[PDB]
Amino acid sequence: EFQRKLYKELVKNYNPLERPVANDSQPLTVYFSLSLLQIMDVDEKNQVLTTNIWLQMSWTDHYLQWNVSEYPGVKTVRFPDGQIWKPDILLYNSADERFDATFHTNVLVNSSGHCQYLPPGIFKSSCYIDVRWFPFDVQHCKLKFGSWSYGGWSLDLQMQEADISGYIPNGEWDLVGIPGKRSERFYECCKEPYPDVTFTVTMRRRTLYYGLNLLIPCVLISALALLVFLLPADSGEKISLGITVLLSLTVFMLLVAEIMPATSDSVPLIAQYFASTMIIVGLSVVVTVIVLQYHHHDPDGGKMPKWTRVILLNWCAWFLRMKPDLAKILEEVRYIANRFRCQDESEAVCSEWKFAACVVDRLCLMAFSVFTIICTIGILMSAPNFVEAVSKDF
Amino acid sequence: EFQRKLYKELVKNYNPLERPVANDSQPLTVYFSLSLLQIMDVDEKNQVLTTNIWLQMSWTDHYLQWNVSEYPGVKTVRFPDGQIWKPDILLYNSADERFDATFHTNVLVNSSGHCQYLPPGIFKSSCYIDVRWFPFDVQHCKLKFGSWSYGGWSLDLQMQEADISGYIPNGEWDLVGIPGKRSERFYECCKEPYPDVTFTVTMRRRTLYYGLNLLIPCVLISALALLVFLLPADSGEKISLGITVLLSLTVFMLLVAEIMPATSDSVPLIAQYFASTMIIVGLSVVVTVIVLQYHHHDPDGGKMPKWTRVILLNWCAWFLRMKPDLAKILEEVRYIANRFRCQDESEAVCSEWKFAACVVDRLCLMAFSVFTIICTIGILMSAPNFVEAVSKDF
Amino acid sequence: EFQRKLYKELVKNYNPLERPVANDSQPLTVYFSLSLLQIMDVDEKNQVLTTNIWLQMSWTDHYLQWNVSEYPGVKTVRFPDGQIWKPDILLYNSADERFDATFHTNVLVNSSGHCQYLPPGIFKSSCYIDVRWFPFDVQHCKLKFGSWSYGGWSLDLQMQEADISGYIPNGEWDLVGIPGKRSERFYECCKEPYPDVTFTVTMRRRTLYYGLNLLIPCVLISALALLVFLLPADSGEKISLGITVLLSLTVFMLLVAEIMPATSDSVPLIAQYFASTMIIVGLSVVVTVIVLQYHHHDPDGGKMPKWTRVILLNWCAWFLRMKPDLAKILEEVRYIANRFRCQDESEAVCSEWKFAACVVDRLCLMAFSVFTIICTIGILMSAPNFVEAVSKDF
Amino acid sequence: EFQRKLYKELVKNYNPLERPVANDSQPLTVYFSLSLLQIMDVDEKNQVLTTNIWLQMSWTDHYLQWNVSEYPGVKTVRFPDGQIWKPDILLYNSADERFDATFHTNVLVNSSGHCQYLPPGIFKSSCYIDVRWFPFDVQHCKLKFGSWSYGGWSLDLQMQEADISGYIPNGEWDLVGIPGKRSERFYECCKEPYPDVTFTVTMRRRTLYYGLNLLIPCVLISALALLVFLLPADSGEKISLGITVLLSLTVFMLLVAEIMPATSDSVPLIAQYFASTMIIVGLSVVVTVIVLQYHHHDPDGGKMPKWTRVILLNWCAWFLRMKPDLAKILEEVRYIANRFRCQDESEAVCSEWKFAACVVDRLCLMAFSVFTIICTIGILMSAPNFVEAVSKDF
Amino acid sequence: EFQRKLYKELVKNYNPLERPVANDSQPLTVYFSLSLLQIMDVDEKNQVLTTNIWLQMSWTDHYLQWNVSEYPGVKTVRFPDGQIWKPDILLYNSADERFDATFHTNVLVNSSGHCQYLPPGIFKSSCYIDVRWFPFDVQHCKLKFGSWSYGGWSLDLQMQEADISGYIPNGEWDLVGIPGKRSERFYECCKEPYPDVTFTVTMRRRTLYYGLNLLIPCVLISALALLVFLLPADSGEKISLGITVLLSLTVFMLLVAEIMPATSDSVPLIAQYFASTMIIVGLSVVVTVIVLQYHHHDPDGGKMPKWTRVILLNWCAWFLRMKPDLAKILEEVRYIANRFRCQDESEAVCSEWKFAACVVDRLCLMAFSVFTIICTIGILMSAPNFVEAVSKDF
């Protein structure tokens, strides 16, 4: 009875085009904020952030004011889209094909005219994803909101601190905060300035998932590559194991490519670590070829360069702690035995070459192990957030 | 004739903005429930639940009341969207880009004013998917429904028990129940509290499909890896078989990655089992390298450490139940035969080393078999629902 | 002139909410049917059927009746959506996100009031896909149509036989028929019963495509696996060929996984055939390991068990139709020759072991060939529709 | 001033439901045509054609006629959707989920009443893709347009020749023409016949892209398979190379499966060529197994069948242009040398068997080369459009 | 008060169909331009460009003019879609399924009538992507805008220079400029000409990302292929390494296929480089087969052709800087030693053949290295933009 009477009363002469101010010259203060409920997705390949947001726009409509003594029990009213004047606050850096993913709900006014509008929405925003430090990355994704067609002389946008009480954790991202900032910028279209409120969603990637699925698996598969330096050459599978492991490591780069954007701003840390890993494994294949050249060396070929005979079989070897008828019968039997002596000398030369191959195996085992350890640690601890990560997520 | 007269009568002075109560001060009781017809999808990578639902909102419109004696035969009327007041009950934790996937249908009222509204919809909900125990997982997905813009002082939401008579089984999920709960929560936006009805869809994953496609296949491929310990070394394919099998096992981890979300809350049970499996296979490769070092051991290299000669060829070996011219001619023929004796001694030393390699093969066959059995069973039976599963689904 | 006059006449006092009956108490007969033009897609992973359909709803509007003598030449009129009363016949088991994929077109009425409404649409329906017999499967997909908000006491739904004259064949599916059925069911929401018309689209999968791309390719690749039993052991590639072929066969299971749903209702026939195939190939690898153990057997190791020496080298072998100074010089030359005799005896023992390996090769060639033939035929001919298929599609 | 006056004048008593004819009994002539701007996509897996089209519907509205002397300068007017009567010409064989992808624009009328309507749209059409001859295929995709709800007695549809002046070439398809045809068909729904205009878009696939990425790559990889017949057997990699190449060739069949639909109407030419290629490579593996059986033949096993000793080492071989104490000492030394003579005879028998293996290598090199050349050319030149293609696209 | 009065005043007799000119005969000048904010995507497979654009349409409405002295403080008004006349400027070469991706916002007018309309949108445009020079490619994507239904005699379209102040860099593309051009074209539909404004977005691909992920990885994997010419033949893994590396290189062609469109206009530079690389690696496999034929050459087979003995072991070899009872006992011992001499001669012939294999290894190492260097550099520096790229992006 009083809700009916008031609803009829409030739409007499009301125009949803008129900015609801009493004095036309003064701008209309709109307080803007948001409640972040969830970080639904971070599409780094497409540079998009999908969030569940409850935008919070509060202002004062000069015309929607009633005296509750004359409408007992009627303390608030609600208006759907298109019936009340609303601020046309859009997300500037939107990535949604419709460009406006907001779901239009009611505007709740009280007896004093204060209008409250809390549209829910799944919002896609074009966010620059700094992949320089991935997986130990922190992203600062801006959500820039402003009135599209009202300038500062008409809509005085004011910012209120972001709401995160109802935020639901993600699993992959630790909300580090949503600091906001109000700016007054000038545009090349127009002379009247335009204010905007930009909320910078700061997100820390939780590194356990990518650590367990990308970093540690590659470390351990990369470690298998070093087993080539412990394999004997006579097994006939050094090259097979090494080349198989290297070409298996490409799957991780393929996975990263499925994740990372095709940008040239920088090289992600994961790529630099994966690249150094493959280069070290590839150099192990090159060194395996050299080792097999030493092992399969023709004894009657070139002689052993003194530089090799000392740099490897003396120093590096020590460092590693390795270490008438009867005359015709005499002639024939002496050729057989001299042939055997020549074969013994050839085996001895081949044995020394095989020893050189083994010494090289051990030196490169040590050197590639040290290279792996340093490169891995020095590339991973070059991330500013590395320590924070290992402490929080492991 | 009477349907026409009544329809004209019911829209005189009717405003779809007014809450249809007789006394403005009292809240309007809306009974909310749903009928779950099907679980269409559980997107665990995106943390979304897609369901076919017939939301059930029943309330009383004070104005839509007629006396059937004056409209004979006209016992119910129907109103489309936008013509009658409706409760704006939205799904809070919606994952749909439009945010509101409800399909708007008629509101069936009777002569007494009781309005019945049963919109169908394909609803996507942002559900936290606990992947800790996958594939033997049980999920509790909340569907939180509430009036967006009416608080407790205006819309007295009441819950009715969920309907599942028409539920159509899924194939992958056993509905364990849909218990509901009505809550009265306060929000940081507003002072008036807001009630909601949350239905927790409890779902048990049927484990036959993932058991047959992930667990048993990996067990059997992982078992092939143990055949390396039965392969002879002279075959020259131990490393080939082992490394090939391990890098083949990566496909299962790739499949899981296609399924699982990128979250750091926990490690899924499937991942822990797959990881232990690959580590055991990788250790078999490491032990294969050691075995080949023993098999391909240079007889003139280091001598056999006593610790090895006993720990392997005495105890472990027993445990396993294994086990002038003529003078010149004499000189030359004696060098040939002494050379043969030296080769025999070298074959004997190599034969002992090959025996050590075989004993290690057998010990690691036993040990890796026991490791496989324990780890597999102890990781699978660490799931609370494991027994329930094996009994219902196998 | 007469079309204008009649259109103005027909909308006087017309309300699109009123069911167009003369007597309010009697239900309104709506004849429902459909014309199936094409089967666009069968998504078995998502359990959805996409069809091009021209729903056919015919009824009688009591008010849209004119005398053609008073409107010469005006024999039919047309009304767009929202202007005429229509039956709100929805597809209950809809899988479309909008839930209602119907495209709203005109309602053609004649001078006698008979209204004809033929909306086109691309309809997605949640259909249970029985994958038990795939690829030789027949599916029965229900399209359940009914008025959402009118019960039996108001809308007397009646079924007309489905139209298939304009049906366009698919390539993958042979329409076996679209039998319909009218049901009168009661629902737990309401007391008035609700009728529905369900058309069961029965579809036979044409098996040539999946036969050529899945079954015959796997048969032939699986046949290559049997070549291991004809490969000599000295080639040093038995394990390589066998393990390579088995891990190559996984691609077919991966393809099926891309096709099949993740359901535990049953095991598809394709999976049972692929699984038996991989198990037979995997057992060939196990038997290859045993063969290589026999081939690479240390002559000075264990002696040949009599059970083996007869079960293989006697019966199975036959069945297969296989089959002072001079004294010092005498001493030294006699040791060399006795060494040669010991090597000859060792070669003879190794030769017998290699013969055992060859006999096992042949027996398993025969046995795995017979296993392959039976298992393949017995799993494929266990499908009821197998014969129908091979006759129609090959 | 005159544009305002005329716009007000033209909507007096205008009803967008009335067919704008002067005499109700006569059908209304609508001239239909289209301008094809681009062929955006041919989805052969889904059997859909996506095109950018400017449908051209011209007719005469009896009511939208003004005398330009009374409205100086006002020579044309424009009307948006829903304000003027339009022909409801839909695309019958539509594949779009909305079913109607047309974008509604203005209808430009002149002073004489001739209405011109040129809606743009991205149109998806359900087109049967004959994949029999792919990649050398020509497709005939029908776009069938007609009034949905006006029959021949009301809407006299007439066809105008298709417009292609503004057509933008594609890269993959050579528009061979868009011949149209007007038909008058009867439908099982209705008695009044219904006319339609069907434009058959005829498209020739440009074969350079698929030739370079599928046909020539497979030819060259398939050629590598023939290198097995030039590899020596002692290399120990014949089976490895052959089996690796064959299982690598599966990627091309996987690519085709990603492209081709799952239809049983026919076997695409690409599939028949790829299948013959894999069968020839697979037979090379089978022949490699036989070659290795000849190479690794036990000299003390079966004797050489005369049929082999002539069919291979005589004819085929020629065709190819290949080709007391002292007594004890005498006894012992004569056993050693007789042992050597037995080894020489065994090497000779093995040498003849290895020669047989080499002759078989050469014969199968020749035969599989000829098989490859014929099969390739005879399958590729069995396409009617093969010559046209090679001449236009290479 | 004055905003309300003016809004009521401005819609009296206003018709959004009338072109707002004072003199009907003269065309209406519309100034068109755009502000490019971001290049969201370049889909080269689909030939589509996705951009964030703020179209800028400014014109003069003759009717929306007020005197600010009579409406103090009211200096601008705003009108939503459908209430004010707007230019129907569409994107002709649109690729969006809806065809019109513009988001409709307000039209800001001032007291003098100048209307300003700045709709945001995510625009998809059908752009011909010249992939001839990819990854060092520059694309010229046209955005063609024009009034759909107003010709030159009615809407005088005029171009304003594109705005790029607020442009946000991409990562993958360097905006080289957005030059625009106004054209006056005639169409085959109509006699009145139609003007359009086409903005050609010129974009330079930043080549660091594709350089690091495609070009350098392939170079380095292709370099591993050359290690076959340094591998010894006795290792028994030349063919394995070479064939494995070649079939691994196919992944890059697969990646390019995922990126490139299926067009026959040209061959992308990346494809020509990848193709030459695989052909060079494939020829290394062919040469590896020849090398193994030389290494595994039967000594008692054909004799060494003089042409080989000089072209390889003399010139190329030098260029590369390589280099009674006792009588019976005499008979028997002389046969053994003559057998040894025959084996020595056979080893010498085999040794010369192995030397030929080694010389061929070295020559092809040199030749394939030079081929790799030239082909790589000559294909990469055949791109016009190659130098620009290497200087800006590396």
Ligand SMILES: Clc1ccc([C@H]2C[C@@H]3CC[C@H]2N3)cn1
């Ligand atoms: Cl009513 C109408 C609609 C479209 C057109 C056409 C003329 C120019 C070129 C295509 C389109 N714009 C002309 N008239």
Ligand SMILES: [Ca+2]
């Ligand atoms: Ca993420």
Ligand SMILES: [Ca+2]
């Ligand atoms: Ca699921």
Ligand SMILES: [Ca+2]
């Ligand atoms: Ca199907």
Ligand SMILES: [Ca+2]
């Ligand atoms: Ca195509």
Ligand SMILES: [Ca+2]
């Ligand atoms: Ca791009």
